[PDB]
Amino acid sequence: DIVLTQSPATLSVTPGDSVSLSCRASQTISNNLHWYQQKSHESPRLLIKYASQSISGIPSRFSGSGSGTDFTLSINSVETEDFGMYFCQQSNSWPRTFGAGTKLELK
Amino acid sequence: EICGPGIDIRNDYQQLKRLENCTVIEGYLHILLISRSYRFPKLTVITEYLLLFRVAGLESLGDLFPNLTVIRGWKLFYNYALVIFEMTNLKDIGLYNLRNITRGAIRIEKNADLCYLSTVDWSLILDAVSNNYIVGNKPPKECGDLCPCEKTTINNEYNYRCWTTNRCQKMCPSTCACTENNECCHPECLGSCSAPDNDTACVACRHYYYAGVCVPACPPNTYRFEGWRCVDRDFCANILSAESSDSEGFVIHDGECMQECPSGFIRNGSQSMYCIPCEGPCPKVCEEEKKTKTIDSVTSAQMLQGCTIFKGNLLINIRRGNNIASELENFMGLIEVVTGYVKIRHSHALVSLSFLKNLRLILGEEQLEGNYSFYVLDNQNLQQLWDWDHRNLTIKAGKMYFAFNPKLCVSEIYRMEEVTGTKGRQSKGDINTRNNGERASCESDVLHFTSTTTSKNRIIITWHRYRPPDYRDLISFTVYYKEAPFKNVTEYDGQDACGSNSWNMVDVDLPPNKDVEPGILLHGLKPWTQYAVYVKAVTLTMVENDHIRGAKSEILYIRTNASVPSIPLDVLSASNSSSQLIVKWNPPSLPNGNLSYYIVRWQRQPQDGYLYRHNYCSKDKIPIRKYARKVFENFLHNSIFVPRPYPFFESRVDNKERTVISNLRPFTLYRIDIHSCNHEAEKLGCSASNFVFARTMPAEGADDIPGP
Amino acid sequence: FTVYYKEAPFKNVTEYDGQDACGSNSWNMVDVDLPPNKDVEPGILLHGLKPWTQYAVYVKAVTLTMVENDHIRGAKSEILYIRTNASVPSIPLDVLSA
Amino acid sequence: QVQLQQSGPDVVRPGVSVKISCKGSGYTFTDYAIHWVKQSHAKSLEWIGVISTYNGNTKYNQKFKGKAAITVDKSSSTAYLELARLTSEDSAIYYCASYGDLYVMDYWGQGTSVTVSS
Amino acid sequence: TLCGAELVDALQFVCGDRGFYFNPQTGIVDECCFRSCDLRRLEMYCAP
Amino acid sequence: TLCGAELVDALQFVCGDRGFYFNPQTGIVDECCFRSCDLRRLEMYCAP
Ligand SMILES: *[C@@H]1O[C@H](CO)[C@@H](O[C@@H]2O[C@H](CO)[C@@H](O[C@H]3O[C@H](CO)[C@@H](O[C@H]4O[C@H](CO)[C@@H](O)[C@H](O)[C@@H]4O)[C@H](O)[C@@H]3O)[C@H](O)[C@H]2NC(C)=O)[C@H](O)[C@H]1NC(C)=O
Ligand SMILES: *[C@@H]1O[C@H](CO)[C@@H](O[C@@H]2O[C@H](CO)[C@@H](O)[C@H](O)[C@H]2NC(C)=O)[C@H](O)[C@H]1NC(C)=O
Ligand SMILES: *[C@@H]1O[C@H](CO)[C@@H](O)[C@H](O)[C@H]1NC(C)=O
Ligand SMILES: *[C@@H]1O[C@H](CO)[C@@H](O)[C@H](O)[C@H]1NC(C)=O
Ligand SMILES: *[C@@H]1O[C@H](CO)[C@@H](O)[C@H](O)[C@H]1NC(C)=O
């Protein structure tokens, strides 16, 4: 299969700061990396499609980047609503695999 | 409401209820083996074919689908778009709204009570009326085809046209695709019309359909799905083909949304919704669930047949087996890339890895403990790898370990890492000279041939006497010979010491007299055939010096002398006209040389002398002489029932195997002798004759009275 | 290790029944490695056997000696006869009635 | 107005089978495939299979082929995730994802908690 | 051996009201018509 | 393929006045009747 490793396990952030998450893959994937936000006691919600392009509904604060084996998720203005777990999903080949999860806790 | 991609109703009469909401049936429709009143006015279009078989109680098709208008027949059932077979109690095809059948033909068979067959003008409903099949129904002479309307010419007759005893066959005027009563439809429309010449008021669209509109070609951001509608890009990204191990989504190609990329195309990486043109033979990547595929038998290697790239690891452990070199080469001969490692352990039957021909890349996703990508161990008969100076190879990552391979010369694996590209990557114990090359004879002497004498089936060949390096060594010889069409012949083509795949071996001893040199006489050979011959020496050393030498000869190519060719094969003759006879044949079985030309002969045969004597006004029979549904029932049964789990004249034909004889007596028997010569037929003589008898065409109007 | 097993109707079975090292005449051979953990002993699982059938099994050891001592030893096991458990019989064949 | 409603929480003893419903609404149920995701703990999100609501075919994860079984109900607009011979490791929260494609999972169901108790 | 309409008559007789199951063209003709098959093989073409 | 009385008619025609030679029952029927044989094979059943 293909494994996704998200670099920061936990990120202690205060509201108003700018943070950037990372998610690296074993095999080379041109795009096909999709980000998901999951707050506590909820279901994960899609944030970024295909590494870069966004979704109608999510705020302009979120932004994705990267190509190949390195990918980036950047919350430009962290707010009190954005605190929760984050995931990256691989979709180039089968099976679909997720990341280990990056917890964005309060500092 | 679209229903699909295939409706198969059978057994239960009440299972027919699945059509309560369907207005369009995407795919085929099966109403089989059915044993009350069910009406479905919703259904109007069926994309593929419609099949009915052994439905008891149904009297007319109008009882079920009265509004069925178009059977597009995108995919056909044995080239048929509608099959009504063995329908009991059925009296008429009540599809009085059927207007257009786009593709296939019709097969209506074995309906003992079916009427109104000739009352339907199928020439205005479908196109290929010639390929229809209406046999075995109720005979029109024993029915009573009565109408309660219009009419036209059917075959050579002109008679009324009706579907049933209450409804006629509806037709459009000559001015037009029309509505219920004389108003032409839209050009992109088909069948009937809820409103005249409107796109959004069509019972069925010709060409394609999208958003309630009959469109000729799909809108720019839509693609062809099935054969009647257009879907967007996100729809075919949600479709999934029939479940298999290598089952994936649908592809978008040429503005069409198909199940798999067509022939000569492969799926693009990452962007797996489009097909990229592969120029060569596109690969057949084989993915197996088990991490390391172990090849412990020829039956186990069968799953690797036709694979180009192997996503996994190869573990070769072939102790016993049959004829293996030619067998694995059928399965694994096409493998080119191995994603993991390759381990040849305990493969005693393998004398060479040549069965892995096109293997030109070994990666190294997973490597054995110690970072090894190529690992051989305990191969008591592996004389050589598949690494000769012709093949290419590249191990991207990993090391190579060689141990307990006695017949493998250690110099052969040093030559491997040159092409492999791992010269200084291994350790000092990975390649050791102690247990490898123990019984191998690397540097060997050269046996020189002395004379060769060739006939049509015997070859005498002698080589020089060979004094062994030691005085005490007992010396013997072995002759390896086999029929080789051309010269690319390697010495390794068998398996173990039992591989009788190719080389025929004869052990000839050194002659007692020292003045005569060792030779061998080969008997029973094909004339004009190139044979590959080489001699190997059997040096049984009394002093087991591990400085093994041995003697081996060069591959000598010897072709036997030509002979009389074989008779031509399968002589057939016919007469397309009087005074002319066409004859065709096949080349001989054993040409025994290069074919030059054919010699055909034709001799006039006399008319029967017994024919002239008898008085034929008394005999009743006068002698005359000449010139020159089950298969569908098997297909229907194999698909429905699925079980639960005179002087001679002589001419020469220069090139072809066909000729035409001219100037002949009409309606006269001829003997046709055909010979086959070769390049050496000037001295040897041409072959024998495979003869046939043929009579010409009768002279028309020549056997009548020529006067008053 | 190497496991030699074959279906034997009765016991008169010899170890030599093939030819060369390719004689697949009788014995089915499976190479199982010594397990890494020293507490577990080497074994083999045979799959796809006929119910109620006596099988002749014996194991031979593959000793690759680094020091080629011509005092060759090796290890070989006794011919063990093992019959599988009975199962539901097959349906009767060719039922004819008059 | 797209929404996916899954079944209620379940607690069953080991060795028994169970299935999880997931009804779709606010969208064409036949136009979108349905994914299934397992979340044993907050760290591991395991995709376990997709079903195509159009044709009814499926594609599973190899680690869940002999364990899971995904079915669909076109008329009821409901998918089902069957799980047999449940063990303590399968005690997880399973999610229903659709309104996307075989690549992304746009919308997710609220989740179904499965607990395997001694 | 059963073939053709003679075959489907025996198939409807064996299954009766049970029906026929449905869900590589070496079908029943290449099994019960090309070669002789017993009624146990026929019954496996029915429904559960 | 030639068989029976149809076969011996062609045999007498090929040999004609030459006759038939005579001097393990896989005979001519298992050669020219079971399988297709050409007239060259038939002529070898004649006399010298
Ligand atoms: C089987 O076929 C082999 C060829 O495939 C035969 O080998 C050939 O044998 C001939 C005769 O033994 C040999 O000589 C040929 O070339 C000579 C040079 O042109 C030629 O001698 C000429 O000069 C003579 C006077 O100087 C004159 O008297 C003669 O008529 C010629 O004009 C000789 O006669 C013959 O034409 C070939 O060299 C040889 N070929 C090869 C490739 O070895 C072999 O004999 C055949 N054996 C049997 C048993 O049929
Ligand atoms: C039923 O409608 C189809 C619509 O395609 C007709 O198909 C025509 O087939 C001919 C021969 O292949 C083509 O040259 C035409 O271009 C097709 N029509 C169109 C609109 O493309 C078919 O002839 C119709 N049949 C009847 C009996 O009317
Ligand atoms: C020799 O090479 C030619 C051309 O590649 C090929 O047709 C032939 O089969 C080869 N010989 C053998 C024995 O495969
Ligand atoms: C064993 O001996 C019996 C009696 O002689 C014989 O029937 C049987 O064939 C023998 N076994 C083998 C393998 O030949
Ligand atoms: C058809 O429509 C009915 C409502 O009349 C509904 O109950 C049913 O689920 C629909 N589908 C089928 C296949 O009957």
B272:A92 CB<8 A: yes
Which ligand 3 atom is at minimum distance from the Cα of B484? 13
Query: Measured in angstroms, how far is the CA atom of residue B592 from the centroid of ligand 1?
Result: 19
D43:A101 CB<8 A: yes
Looking at all shown ligands, the one closest to residue C14's CA atom is 4
Asked if B669 is an interface residue toward chain F (Cβ–Cβ < 8 A), one would say: no
CB B573 within 8 A of CB B582: yes
Domain limits, chain A: 1-107
Question: Top-level CATH class of B445-560?
Answer: mainly beta
Instruction: Work out whether strand B256-258 and strand B157-160 pair parallel, antiparallel, or are unpaired.
Output: unpaired
**B313 CB-near residues (< 8 Å, 6+ apart):** B291, B292, B293, B338, B340, B341, B342, B343, B366
The residue of chain A nearest to residue D4, with distances taken between CA atoms, is A43
Pick the CATH number of A1-107 from 2.130.10.10, 2.60.40.10, 3.90.740.10, 3.40.30.10: 2.60.40.10
**E32 CB-near residues (< 8 Å, 6+ apart):** E1, E2, E3, E7, E41, E42
Sign of the Cα pseudo-torsion (D89, D90, D91, D96, in order): positive
CB B598 within 8 A of CB B681: no
Q: Which of C20, C16, C22 is nearest to B322 (CA)?
A: C22
Residue B25 CA to residue A30 CA, distance in Å, equals: 40
E strand or H helix at B674, and its extent?
strand B669-678
CB D88 within 8 A of CB D14: yes
Tokens (6 digits) for F31 = 């050669």
After what residue numbers is chain E broken, C–N > 2.5 angstroms? 23
Q: Name the CATH architecture for the domain at C1-84.
A: Sandwich (2.60)
Tell which of E2, E8, E26, E46 to mutate to test the B interface (max B CBs under 10 Å). Answer: E8
Instruction: Work out whether strand B669-678 and strand B595-604 pair parallel, antiparallel, or are unpaired.
Output: antiparallel
Tokens (6 digits) for B507 = 């052990």
C66:B296 CB<8 A: no
DSSP characters over D72-107: EETTTTEEEEEE-S--GGG-SEEEEEESS-SS---E
Q: 10 Å Cβ neighbour count for D104?
A: 21
Instruction: Work out whether strand B208-210 and strand B24-25 pair parallel, antiparallel, or are unpaired.
Output: unpaired
What string of H, E and C letters represents the secondary structure of F14-35?
A: HHCCCCECCCCCCCCHHHHHCC
B237:D62 CB<8 A: no
Sign of the Cα pseudo-torsion (B193, B195, B200, B206, in order): positive
Tokens (6 digits) for B375 = 């690992």
Cross-sheet strand order for the sheet of B213-215: B213-215, B208-210, B229-232, B222-225, B256-258, B251-253
The contact set of E with B (CB < 8 A) is: 4-5, 7-8, 11-12, 18-23, 25-30, 33, 44-48
Tell which of E1, E36, E38 to mutate to test the C interface (max C CBs under 10 Å). Answer: E38
Q: Name the CATH architecture for the domain at B285-420.
A: Alpha-Beta Horseshoe (3.80)
Residue D109 CA to residue D76 CA, distance in Å, equals: 17
- Nearest CA of chain C to the CA of B369: how many Å? 13
Virtual CA dihedral for B430, B436, B441, B443, nearest 10 degrees?
30
Closest Cα to atom 3, ligand 4: which residue?
Answer: C12
A30:B271 CB<8 A: yes
What string of H, E and C letters represents the secondary structure of B66-97?
A: CCCCEECCCCCCCCEEEEEECCCCCCECCCCC
Residue B286 CA to residue B245 CA, distance in Å, equals: 10
| Best residue among C7, C12, C25 to mutate for probing ligand 4, ranked by most atoms within 8 Å of CB | C12
Resolution reading in Å: 3.3
Query: Measured in angstroms, how far is the CA atom of residue B76 from the centroid of ligand 2?
Result: 17
CB C64 within 8 A of CB B403: yes
CB B361 within 8 A of CB B384: no
Domains of chain F with CATH codes: 1-48 (1.10.100.10)
With a 6 Å cutoff on the Cβ, whether B433 touches ligand 3 is no
DSSP state, residue B279? S
Sign of the Cα pseudo-torsion (B89, B92, B98, B99, in order): positive
Cross-sheet strand order for the sheet of B449-454: B449-454, B459-463, B519-522
CB B533 within 8 A of CB B556: yes
Residue F7 CA to residue B625 CA, distance in Å, equals: 18
E strand or H helix at B416, and its extent?
helix B410-420
* Residue type at C29 in one-letter notation: M
* Residue type at B689 in one-letter notation: S
DSSP state, residue C37? S
| Best residue among B455, B459, B561, B594 to mutate for probing ligand 1, ranked by most atoms within 8 Å of CB | B561
CB B569 within 8 A of CB B586: yes
Ligand 5 binding site (Cβ under 6 Å of any ligand atom): B 18, 20-21; D 75
With a 6 Å cutoff on the Cβ, whether B455 touches ligand 1 is yes
DSSP characters over B489-528: --S--S-TTT-TTS-EEE--BPPSSTTSPPEEEE-S--SS
* Residue type at B18 in one-letter notation: R
E strand or H helix at D19, and its extent?
strand D18-25
DSSP characters over E13-48: HHHTTS-B-------SIIIIISS---HHHHHTTB--
Query: Measured in angstroms, how far is the CA atom of residue B593 from the centroid of ligand 1?
Result: 17
CB B167 within 8 A of CB B152: no
Residue D99: left (phi > 0), alpha (psi -120 to 50), or beta? Answer: left
Q: 10 Å Cβ neighbour count for B558?
A: 19
